[PDB]
From a paper:
The trimeric spike (S) protein is the major glycoprotein on the [name]-[name]-2 envelope and is responsible for engaging the [name] receptor for viral entry, and thus, it is a prime target for vaccine design and therapeutic antibody development. Receptor-binding domain ([name]) in the S protein plays an essential role in [name] receptor recognition, and mutations in the [name] affecting receptor binding and viral infection have been reported. To unravel the underlying molecular mechanism of the S proteins of Omicron BA.2, BA.2.12.1, BA.2.75, and BA.4/5 bound to hACE2, we determined their atomic structures of the S (BA.2, BA.2.12.1 or BA.4/5) or [name] (BA.2.75) in complex with hACE2 by cryo-EM or X-ray crystallography. According to our previous reports, the binding interface between [name] and [name] could be divided into two patches (patch 1 and patch 2).
Author numbering:
A (entry chain A): 19 to 614
B (entry chain B): 333 to 527
């Protein structure tokens, strides 16, 4: 028998036992998440240990089948999933050190406390606390104190742990035949062997740079608008030809600009569209919200939800003595068990979150027939994009008027469309330069283009050039400001957000074109359109079986990520901003500093 | 008179595994095909080569009733001319098949919290089965070019593997009990007829 014939038998056996072990692990984790108790932690440790072990033994066994002797490109993907070791290639003396470094560097982040000045007894922690001041206060000095306290007494403790993290993971990177840890991260987007659909690892940097070059002007105009409306609020602290101080952007790190609507609203006399009081005045509940979401999905063309979803799934906070997490998640336990845990309330935000998680569940249901190792999204940005387009389409005034929440007499005026577009832009357009800058900095640090003694100096000059944000106080080579974020201190990738943002609008434009919608793109609903549902399902069915280029081509018609639909979404806002910015300066100079 | 024992086949407390399917010969009795309908959801009640309505009009010499428990999504594999895993290594029907196939859900009986590991099915086999044949031998499957010597390991697998039914699994993974009714005409007087 050939080596390709032997591989299929091993894969069948692996799938059979993997499904059962994974279901046990997921059920234990769910039982703990819906019921906090020490016995549940004990249950959740044993199942995890058994799974991780199993997987290690199978990975060890799957390396006696040479790769250059299998020619189906479907066995090849599963063997590539099993064969990767990654972290076990290092010797035992360094594997323990890496785990200790990661655990300690995570503990320093979670257990963090900025003791305020004078009074020493009072001290404040992130989460409830040093996040409320940055999101709601309006005093320059208070915000600067919070910013600098967090930067100084959480980052210096993490600098001489990241300094070893970098080398100890670069060693693992070239121990698995790579060039650095950045290439290891970028390897998700790599496709080899399928003619007309190859995507190399290095093409991602070029694609990101070329998309940002087109995004830039809209960001510049939004930046100018915010600078004007923000210099209005702070009498004389912001120069009119310079950058923006980093401690007054609405959140600690400036990741989202959404906490500026109260200061940058276009027309402050016209309120937004909130239907919470209407829902309350009709005796709504959780079941009604989820049946409306299911009704929308069935109207599009996708199937209903299984009886298990309605029996074994917790939609309301249990209350009483039971304590459970209330972070909305969508669970795919396997073997036909799909559940949603969400502590929902009667609110429009919960109404949209229901659609988001409902789309997660639908996408999970779509590829249930694929092999075990191919039951995931094509890349790391498709799943959340599919989740987000549903919430995009479910918040339009037309859809709300269809379901009775919004009265028919409501008239869409142009003064509210601009408000909605600005509120959306403060969250979508704002985060893209931040994400791009952070990924480029991490890639250069891992590669070796940034010497060990120029970290912060390079970081802040990039921060000035790309994002237009300037620090209020000077930082030497002792702080570790980028480590101040969950994702840098806990080893997660960050380009997934950029890719998801650019994918969701491509999907939305394709679906709206399939639905014969006329007018602006932001007023589009894909309800009552079976063509759009079929076009979407054609890609949801594939999973990881096909390259993500082909999956994108199935829906959009192109083999690469494109940043024209997003600009088409924000055309009225761009015209309005150009009209409003005819007496100011668009752009910033990287010389002015609030500390002079 | 004398009423064939269909309620020892459709109502037993324990069914057999797929690879050890029970076959019961029914002869020398009057069979009414009407207590059979007094179930409920009959997920599948397909009849091949025989009219279900005109069923109480034809006489046969032997009637065979097979019993086993399979998964929900494998019911479609019990039909003449199907390829897969159950119909190649566990239970295969001839192309010129006369009879009926009946299936129904048994989640409330054959499923327990923790895992009902009492149901097995063969997954490895050198060659396909001939129609109406069973194999209950447990020897290690040699998937490689080296002798196995009766020990499980590399390129050596145990041919049987359990189902593990839990009460929260989906419809496609829930237990289903299947009874197959077979008929034949031989060179003997037909001693099986309806009332
Ligand atoms: C939560 O755990 C407690 C103690 O283990 C148990 O008594 C209770 O029944 C559990 N709740 C549910 C819904 O299973
Ligand atoms: C790859 O293997 C699958 C079975 O898992 C088979 O259906 C498919 O035809 C194979 N590919 C080719 C090109 O034959
Ligand atoms: C680790 O990975 C390398 C390259 O993939 C491989 O050659 C090696 O055998 C693996 N080690 C084990 C035992 O997992
Ligand atoms: C469920 O799905 C079927 C098939 O699409 C449809 O006819 C039915 O109206 C849906 N509604 C229910 C009852 O879930
Ligand atoms: C709405 O349109 C009218 C007519 O063109 C214009 O005068 C008005 O300024 C517009 N309002 C907004 C908010 O664009
Ligand atoms: C979808 O079609 C149904 C039936 O024609 C209708 O009741 C509903 O209002 C439609 N929804 C939208 C958003 O047009
Ligand atoms: C199965 O046995 C139970 C036990 O009395 C009886 O109630 C039921 O009617 C029987 N069903 C059939 C189809 O014989
Ligand atoms: Zn989500």
């Amino acid at each position: 028998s050939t080596i390709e014939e032997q591989a299929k038998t091993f894969l069948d056996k692996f799938n059979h036992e993997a499904e059962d072990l994974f279901y046990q692990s997921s059920l234990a984790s769910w039982n703990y998440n819906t019921n906090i108790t020490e016995e549940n932690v004990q249950n959740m440790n044993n199942a995890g240990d058994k799974w991780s072990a199993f997987l290690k033994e199978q990975s060890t066994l799957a390396q006696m089948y040479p790769l250059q002797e299998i020619q189906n490109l479907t066995v090849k993907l599963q063997l590539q999933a099993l064969q990767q070791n990654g972290s076990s290639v290092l010797s035992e003396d360094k594997s323990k050190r890496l785990n200790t470094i990661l655990n300690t560097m995570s503990t320093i982040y979670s257990t963090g406390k900025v003791c305020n000045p004078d009074n020493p007894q009072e001290c404040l922690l992130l989460e409830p606390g040093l996040n409320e001041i940055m999101a709601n206060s309006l005093d320059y000095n208070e915000r600067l104190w919070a910013w600098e306290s967090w930067r100084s007494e959480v980052g210096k403790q993490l600098r001489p742990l990241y300094e070893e993290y970098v080398v100890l993971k670069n060693e693992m990177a070239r121990a698995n035949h790579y060039e650095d840890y950045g290439d290891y991260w970028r390897g998700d987007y790599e496709v080899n062997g399928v003619d007309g659909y190859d995507y190399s690892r290095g093409q991602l940097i070029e694609d990101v740079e070329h998309t940002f070059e087109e995004i830039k002007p809209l960001y510049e105009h939004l930046h100018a608008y915010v600078r004007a409306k923000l210099m209005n609020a702070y009498p004389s602290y912001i120069s009119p030809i310079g950058c923006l101080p980093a401690h007054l952007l609405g959140d600690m790190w400036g990741r989202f600009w959404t906490n500026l609507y109260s200061l940058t609203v276009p027309f402050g006399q016209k309120p937004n569209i909130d239907v919470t009081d209407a829902m309350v005045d009709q005796a709504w509940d959780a079941q009604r919200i989820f049946k409306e979401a299911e009704k929308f999905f069935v109207s599009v063309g996708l199937p209903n939800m299984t009886q298990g979803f309605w029996e074994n799934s917790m939609l309301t906070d249990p209350g009483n003595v039971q304590k459970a997490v209330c972070h909305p998640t969508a669970w795919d336990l396997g073997k036909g068990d799909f559940r949603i845990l969400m502590c929902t309330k009667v609110t429009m935000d919960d109404f949209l979150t229901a659609h988001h998680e409902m789309g997660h569940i639908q996408y999970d249901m779509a590829y249930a027939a694929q092999p075990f190792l191919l039951r995931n999204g094509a890349n790391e940005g498709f799943h959340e994009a599919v989740g987000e387009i549903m919430s995009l389409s479910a918040a339009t005034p037309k859809h709300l008027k269809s379901i009775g929440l919004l009265s028919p007499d409501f008239q869409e005026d142009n003064e509210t469309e601009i408000n909605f577009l600005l509120k959306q832009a403060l969250t979508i357009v704002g985060t893209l330069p931040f994400t791009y800058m952070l990924e480029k900095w991490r890639w250069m640090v891992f590669k070796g283009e940034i010497p060990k003694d120029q970290w912060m100096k390079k970081w802040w000059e990039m921060k000035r050039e790309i994002v237009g944000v300037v620090e209020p106080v000077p930082h030497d080579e002792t702080y570790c400001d980028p480590a101040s974020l969950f994702h840098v201190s806990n080893d997660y990738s960050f380009i997934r957000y950029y890719t998801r943002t650019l994918y969701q609008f491509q999907f939305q434009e394709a679906l709206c074109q399939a639905a014969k919608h006329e007018g602006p793109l932001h007023k589009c609903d894909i309800s009552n359109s079976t063509e759009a549902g079929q076009k979407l399902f054609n890609m949801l069915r594939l999973g990881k079986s096909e390259p993500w280029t082909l999956a994108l081509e199935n829906v959009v018609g192109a083999k690469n990520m494109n940043v024209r639909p997003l600009l088409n979404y924000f055309e009225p806002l761009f015209t309005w901003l150009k009209d409003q910015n005819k007496n100011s300066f668009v752009g910033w100079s990287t010389d002015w500093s609030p500390y002079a | 008179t004398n009423l064939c024992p269909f309620d020892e086949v459709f109502n037993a407390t324990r069914f057999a595994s797929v690879y050890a399917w029970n076959r019961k010969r029914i002869s020398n009795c009057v069979a009414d095909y009407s207590v059979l309908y007094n179930f409920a959801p009959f997920f599948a009640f397909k009849c091949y080569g025989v009219s279900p309505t005109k069923l109480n009009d034809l006489c046969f010499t032997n009637v065979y009733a097979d019993s086993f428990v399979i998964r929900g999504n494998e019911v479609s594999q019990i039909a003449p001319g199907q390829t897969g895993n159950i119909a190649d290594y566990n239970y295969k029907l001839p192309d010129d098949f006369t009879g009926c196939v009946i299936a129904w859900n048994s989640n409330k009986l054959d499923s327990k919290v923790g895992g009902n590991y009492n149901y097995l099915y063969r997954l490895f086999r050198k060659s396909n089965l001939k129609p109406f044949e069973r194999d209950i031998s447990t020897e290690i499957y040699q998937a490689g070019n080296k002798p196995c010597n009766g020990v499980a390991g590399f390129n050596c697998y145990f041919p049987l593997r359990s189902y593990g039914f839990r009460p929260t699994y989906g419809v496609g993974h829930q237990p289903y009990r299947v009874v197959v009714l077979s008929f034949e005409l031989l060179h003997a007087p037909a001693t099986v007829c309806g009332p």
